[PDB]
């Protein structure tokens, strides 16, 4: 599994100025806790609070990005989700979420 400290190091250096700029792991990173958010977002809090000391940081972080609107959602799609993404994506995404 990846290392939780991967997962808030990786919120922490995310810029709101350098969204075009996402390339690698920290896009799948960053669609699998906006889809932490979009789906659980009561689990995001207490994962943030158990897994951060600054969790209202990472919470209007996770604000702002999501108010930019420059990035993808995604919905309820079965399996296709693991299909046709990075697989880094559902696994920050299910650690996020059991």
Same mark, same amino acid.
């Given at each position: $599994?990846?290392?939780?400290?991967?997962?808030?190091?990786?919120?922490?250096?995310?810029?709101?100025?350098?969204?075009?700029?996402?390339?690698?792991?920290?896009?799948?990173?960053?669609?699998?806790?906006?889809?932490?958010? *979009?789906?659980?977002? *009561?689990?995001?809090?207490?994962?943030?609070?158990?897994?951060?000391?600054n969790?209202?940081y990472?919470?209007?972080?996770?604000?702002?990005?999501? *108010?930019?609107?420059? $990035?993808?959602?995604?919905?309820?799609?079965?399996?296709?989700?693991?299909?046709?993404?990075?697989?880094?994506?559902?696994?920050?995404?299910?650690?996020?979420?059991?």
């Amino acid at each position: $599994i990846i290392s939780t400290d991967e997962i808030i190091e990786c919120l922490q250096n995310a810029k709101i100025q350098d969204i075009e700029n996402w390339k690698g792991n920290n896009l799948a990173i960053i669609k699998g806790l906006i889809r932490t958010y *979009n789906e659980e977002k *009561n689990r995001l809090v207490e994962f943030f609070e158990d897994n951060c000391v600054n969790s209202l940081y990472l919470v209007e972080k996770l604000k702002e990005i999501i *108010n930019s609107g420059s $990035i993808t959602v995604g919905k309820s799609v079965t399996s296709k989700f693991i299909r046709n993404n990075h697989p880094l994506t559902v696994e920050t995404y299910l650690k996020t979420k059991l």
